[PDB]
Symmetry: C4
Subunit: 302 residues, 4 copies
């Protein structure tokens, strides 16, 4: 179908490199709460099954063991691991006392670790899918007298984020005049770093602008050349979740075929009574407007 992009529209990078709970850690945290707990419950049962078997290795280790056999050892383990200590059943032998001592340490430890995970889980920002949105396409048309590359960004579910900032990079394979091969060269796309305009007040959707001039990597991009050019505009938006103070990031990408020459976005903001309304049905919509086909370079130099 289409060429292989380096970053998916959802922000996922299609890279592959070559030849302490670090990996499974994020997994646990990533899990939805219901599966997070169902997950802890499983470990709980396993640890209890394990210590229960250890107690059974000794003879009459537990006073008033009920029910007799493995079952009682299991429930005693439960009250021990969680430090409940009803005590009707309790260690009756030195061997049982050592097993209980070890289980008590392991139980506190496990509670400590599980508690840490819960906190981090709680501090995590909601998935991008439900917080930040980018327009499917970007466009290029004249704005305030200059050919401009634009795309839209909006913050749905109020994720109470502050310190919102946006950065844009152009990914393109190229060869330098000296003959250096640069497969995924990254060029800066100025979207406000020199005016402070890249520090966003993102409440309602915004149309991000990259002015195409002599310093822009798109200085010589024309309607025609777009048809044979190969590039990828990568967008990075970062913010901090106020409630937690956690820094989050949302990313998207626009390949050459997802940039529409001679288009303009429809507005999404409208003034009502008591408030301004955001019509999300127009979020991705654009329409054609009179735009010259020439690159800024062809125009400054013709």
């Amino acid at each position: 179908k289409k060429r292989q992009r380096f970053v998916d529209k959802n922000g996922r990078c299609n890279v592959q490199h070559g030849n302490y709970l670090s990996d499974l850690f994020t997994t646990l945290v990533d899990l939805k709460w219901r599966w997070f707990f169902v997950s802890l419950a499983v470990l709980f049962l396993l640890l209890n099954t394990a210590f229960a078997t250890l107690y059974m290795l000794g003879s009459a280790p537990i006073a008033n063991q009920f029910p007799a056999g493995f079952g009682g050892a299991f429930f005693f383990s439960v009250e021990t691991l969680a430090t409940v200590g009803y005590g009707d059943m309790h260690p009756q032998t030195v061997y049982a006392h050592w097993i209980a001592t070890l289980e008590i340490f392991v139980g506190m430890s496990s509670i400590a670790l599980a508690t840490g995970c819960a906190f981090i889980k709680m501090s995590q920002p909601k998935k991008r899918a439900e917080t930040l949105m980018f327009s499917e396409h970007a466009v290029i048309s004249m704005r305030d007298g200059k050919l401009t590359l634009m795309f839209r960004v909006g913050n749905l579910r109020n994720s109470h984020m502050v310190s919102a900032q946006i950065r844009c990079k152009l990914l393109k394979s190229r060869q330098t005049p000296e003959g250096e091969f640069l497969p995924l060269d990254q060029l800066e796309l100025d979207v406000g770093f020199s005016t402070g305009a890249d520090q966003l007040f993102l409440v309602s959707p915004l149309t991000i602008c990259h002015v195409i001039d002599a310093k822009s990597p798109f200085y010589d991009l024309s309607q025609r050349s777009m048809q044979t050019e190969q590039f990828e505009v990568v967008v990075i938006l970062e913010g901090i979740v106020e409630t937690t103070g956690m820094t989050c990031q949302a990313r998207t990408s626009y390949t050459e075929d997802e940039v529409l020459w001679g288009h303009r976005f429809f507005p999404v903001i409208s003034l009502e009574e008591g408030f301004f309304k955001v019509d999300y049905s127009q979020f991705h919509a654009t329409f054609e407007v009179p735009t010259p086909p020439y690159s800024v370079k062809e125009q400054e130099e013709m």
Copy 2:
């Protein structure tokens, strides 16, 4: 009465979008401590009422159940959910042991979650209402030879915040020369991003300055045009609470009618004996000063 502003003086945005505890989470945390705990107490009682009924489904589930009936099941639940485990009352049947096992897991879980919430609650900065203040009005008058837009900001209750930074945006509906409709266009208002002056040393109140020149959105704003202009200056102040390391933000807004042409603020700082005193009675006060009615543009080009 007055037009509909996009941001209230208190920082609240009047926006409305279109068609895991995420929402109720902030609510709980937002609550005052007394209601936070009264809130946890309610859940505690409910969980205990719930497990108490479960125990009652079995026959003589609890040894020495006291009082007989639901009451004893309730108190046993209490000592179980909180992992106290006095044990005088304790599971007497396999059924009761399974219910207790489940309750113990739920109790640890609940303690873990409630503990997480408490921490976040503790890390939260005090409300703006009691930490950062903005002058009710902004003014425009000559300072150091240049027409300047000014407003005041101060930090009351020492919220031990560092990394204090301020940003200002001009919100205004406009139409581009190419005919693009921009309902809530955001233009940058330079208040120090090019000198480092936007990185504030906020101890005593400060008068924030926006120099009106050729690059300012207010380049052609005159006393006369102000009377028919429609805009909103949005102010964003961010800082970090030292004690907790949490990043916070305070916002305010100034509509065209809240900007006074030809005014100057009264001073609030005074040198005493041993310290400098801040007279907050003059915080919002301004007085008229000789100021030309022309815009900077009319003056540079007349």
Copy 3:
């Protein structure tokens, strides 16, 4: 003695403003560990004394109460508040069960809160007094062909901090040409914001430089004028404690009499065998060097 400075050498601001545990919170956290715990121990004893009296209001509330009287009620309270629940002593009446239920809730709550405080306490950076140091004096002399204001900063106890940044403000009372009174006006002192040099690699001590040119507030400062000038250079250094990720700040100040014209710092760095040594005995030391008495302005315009 000397005039009243706005910021003490130790970073303390001498300001006074006018007419939920927020205040006492920092106090507790500020406390040294030994007093933090001795402080929690006191609350523990008080809470236990309180619940002990409540139990005593009922008759024979506790089974096997030992010792008889208040003492037994106190120890039972202890095992209850901390959720130990030995259970030899346990609620014997409905009244005692309600008191115990309330105490159990309060105990979990207290443990939760105390645990939160401990975490924050642990995340706090060590006091400036033992982490960041500033030279007692600043100096002004020629460096690389330009009159420069300099002072020294060093990081003692490796506080594992990253993202170290420095900012400098000139505090001075002045009157604008238009007649505006500005008691504590803050002017920016460029120390690297336009080269990235304000982002410090602070391992060994550094000499911070402010080049005095036409854009500097000190453009017309001469040896003579220094004798009658009144100002205060406020220095703000911020960093993040790597281990905890907490942002901290150290501040100092230099009044006009603490700035030495025609001086240069002695070096503190020396190359040994296997490492570079820092001689802190030379940290504050400076010596006189041939320096013209004229301000940069008198020199550019003479």
Copy 4:
């Protein structure tokens, strides 16, 4: 062998300065999990051995003490310190009640502290050794018409970091024209601070570039002078671990002998099917390319 560098290739600074758990704190946290817990287990056993001896100072302090003697006092201590409270063994004397009360307080405290440490331990980023890599050498050759200093950086184990930024400093001993001795003077090496290019999108390896021009400290560095020059390029890369929101830093260094004149890096990126592959075998590899031996200064002025 080789001269003494100020920063090792692994980021370690070879500095030595002159004449509350702060030091041992990082140690504990630094420890691998297995040793972290084995470490807590030791304290646990010691505290229990200690309280066990205290109980033994009294006569028949514990009911149903089992086993008789120190052993029973030890196990009772265990159930007390961890707040399990089986209660079969329990305080029988006022003396034992006071010791238990003290142990209970110490146990909660210890659990609180250990829990805090665990959280911080969990929030720590994985060691650089397994997260960020720098090329062994840097090179200098022509790129896009300009003599450029380059080195490579890559992020191995996806440490989910955002807000990635890079800074570069030139460390060199020098003497100012005025005769000031500067042993370890730090000069800024521009690697994108004026284009936003220092804010990296680090997924696949990147070649960092420092353009050598009139403002560069290397303006007069030639192939010949490199042979007798003495300097050290220090590289600082900072990022935030998304999962935890913790800011981390990786550093490296390049002495004059580790900078290869007239070299170029081999590419590491290759386009496969479904993804872009990173060949880490070429990471450190460079080859010679036609490069003039003259410094930029000799060339601009010849």
